[PDB]
Design a protein around this ligand. Structure first.
Ligand SMILES: O=C(O)c1ccc(-c2nn(C(=O)c3c(Cl)cccc3C(F)(F)F)c3cc(C(F)(F)F)ccc23)c(OCc2ccccc2)c1
Lengths: 262, 262
C-alpha cells in the first residue's frame, strides 16, 4: 500500500500542521498542569470566578453562574471548530474531496475531536482554560446546580481514561486525522476516496505508535477502541443538551448570538 | 508480547472451540443462503399464511408479532448459553475473579449475538430455526406497534459487517476480544482482563493478515465495528423498556432479565 518512509513523511506533515493550527499543545498543557513552569489563575469557587473575569477578563465568561460557565464552554467549542477546520485542510487529499463531503465530515467529526483534544487540557483535578492562563477545578465544575453539575463530570471521567494511554502531540495529530476521515458519516456522496485516505492515515498511525511507544503492546488497537468511548459520550452529550434546552428558560442570548452558536 | 507460533496456536484453539460451541456456523449459513443445494433449502416466511405453513414444516393462542418476538427471546437465551460455553474455553477467562466473569458476560453477550446474527443475514432476511426457515426483512418491518422496528437496525449493521467478508476462524477471535473487554462498568481487576485481551488482539491481528493479506487495514476496520455494536445494544435496551411498559402478555426469561438489569 505505502512505503515506510512515506508514512513518516505523512506523520511529520501532520505534526507540523497540528502545531500551527492549535495554540495550546498537549506538551505545553502538561507543563502547566504538572507544575513544571507563570502559575495559572485558579477558579475553584464563586469568588475566585469573579476575580478571574475581572483580572484576566476571560472572553468566554465575560445571568446565573452555572449558565455563564456552560455558555462559556459553548463559546470555546465554536472557536475550536474553526481550528479543526483549518487543520483538516492540511490533511493530504481532504480538499480534493467533494465539497459537500468535506462539510459532512467536519459536521459529524468535530464533537469527537473536541472531546479528544479537551483531554489534553485536563487531569483528574481540573481543566485549563484561555490558552492555559486559567484553571477550573473539577470540584467547582461538578458542584454546579441542577443539570449543569452532571453535564461536566463525564468529560473528566473520559479524559482520565484517555490520558492513561500517554499519547503525545505527534500521536494525536494522526489520530485526529483518522477521526475526520470517517467513511461512515451519514449522507456521504463518495465514500471511497475518504476510506482510501483513512487507510493511509491508519498505516501512518500504526507505525508512529510502534516507533514512539515500542514497549506499549497493542496501543494501536487500544486507541481505536477509544473511538467507542468518544462516539458514546458524544451521543450522551446530545441528550444532555436537549434536556437543558427543554427546561432552562434563563438561557436566551441575543438572537444573533443564538445563531452563531447553532 | 507473544511469539508468532504461539499466536497461531491460540487462533487454532479458539476456532476449534467455536466450532464445538456454536452449531450453526457462518460457513453453514452461507451454504444455505447461497443455494445451489437441494438438501439445505429453507422454507421462506414472508407473510401471515406462509408463517402459518412454517409451523407445520419447520418447528400458539397469541398474536403474530408477539409470537415472533417471543421466538427471538427463546433463541436469545439459547445463544447466551452457547456464548457462555465458548467464553470458558478462552485461556484465562475461568481463572478471573468470579464477579468479573459475570460482568464480562453481562455486557458482552449482546454485542456477540448481534455479531453472530449477521452471519445468518443478508439484505433480504435472516435464517431461523437452525437454518430450516428464512424470515424476510420486509415481513419483519411490517409488524405492528414497536415490533416492526425491532430487527431493522440489526439488518443495517449486518449488511455493513458482512461486507468485511469474515469467516468463522476470524470471528472466533473477534468474539473472544469482545468478551475480554477491560472497560466494562464495575470490573474489579481490570489488569488481568487487559492482559488476556492484549494476547487476543495480537492473535486477531496476525490472523487477519494471513487470512486476508490483500484486505488492507482490516484489523483496524473490524475494531471500528465495535462502535456499531455498542450503539445497536443501546437502542435495543430502550426498545425493550418501551415494550415492558406496554406489553404484559410478555414475560422475559430470567436469564435475559438479569443481563438487562443496569
Ligand atoms: O481549548 C479547547 O480546545 C477546548 C475545547 C473544548 C472545551 C469544552 N467543551 N466542552 C463541552 O461541553 C463540549 C464538548 Cl466536550 C464537545 C462538544 C461541544 C461542547 C459544548 F457543549 F461545550 F459545546 C467542555 C466541557 C467542560 C466540562 F465539562 F468539563 F466542564 C470543559 C471544557 C469543555 C474547552 O473548554 C474551555 C472552557 C471551559 C470552561 C469555561 C470556559 C472555557 C476548551
Amino acid at each position: 500500500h505505502m512505503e515506510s518512509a512515506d508514512l513518516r513523511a505523512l506523520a511529520k506533515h501532520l505534526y507540523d500542521s497540528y502545531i500551527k493550527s492549535f495554540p495550546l499543545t498537549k506538551a505545553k498543557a502538561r507543563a502547566i498542569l504538572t507544575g513544571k513552569t507563570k502559575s495559572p489563575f485558579v477558579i475553584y469557587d464563586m469568588n475566585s470566578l469573579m476575580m478571574g473575569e475581572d483580572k484576566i477578563k476571560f472572553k468566554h465568561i465575560t445571568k446565573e453562574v452555572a449558565i455563564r460557565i456552560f455558555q462559556g464552554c459553548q463559546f470555546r467549542s465554536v472557536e475550536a471548530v474553526q481550528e479543526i477546520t483549518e487543520y483538516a485542510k492540511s490533511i493530504p487529499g481532504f480538499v480534493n474531496l467533494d465539497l459537500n463531503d468535506q462539510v459532512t465530515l467536519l459536521k459529524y467529526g468535530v464533537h469527537e475531536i473536541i472531546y479528544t483534544m479537551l483531554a489534553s487540557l485536563m487531569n483528574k483535578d481540573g481543566v485549563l482554560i484561555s490558552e492555559g492562563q486559567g484553571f477550573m477545578t473539577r470540584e467547582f465544575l461538578k458542584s454546579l446546580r441542577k443539570p449543569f453539575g452532571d453535564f461536566m463530570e463525564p468529560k473528566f471521567e473520559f479524559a482520565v481514561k484517555f490520558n492513561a494511554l500517554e499519547l503525545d502531540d505527534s500521536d494525536l495529530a494522526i489520530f485526529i486525522a483518522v477521526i475526520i476521515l470517517s467513511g461512515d458519516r451519514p449522507g456521504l456522496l463518495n465514500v471511497k476516496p475518504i476510506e482510501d485516505i483513512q487507510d493511509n492515515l491508519l498505516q501512518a498511525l500504526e507505525l508512529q505508535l510502534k516507533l514512539n511507544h515500542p514497549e506499549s503492546s497493542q496501543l494501536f488497537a487500544k486507541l481505536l477502541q477509544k473511538m467507542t468511548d468518544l462516539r458514546q459520550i458524544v451521543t450522551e452529550h446530545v441528550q444532555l443538551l436537549q434536556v437543558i434546552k427543554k427546561t432552562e428558560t434563563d438561557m436566551s442570548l441575543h438572537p444573533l448570538l443564538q445563531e452563531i452558536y447553532k
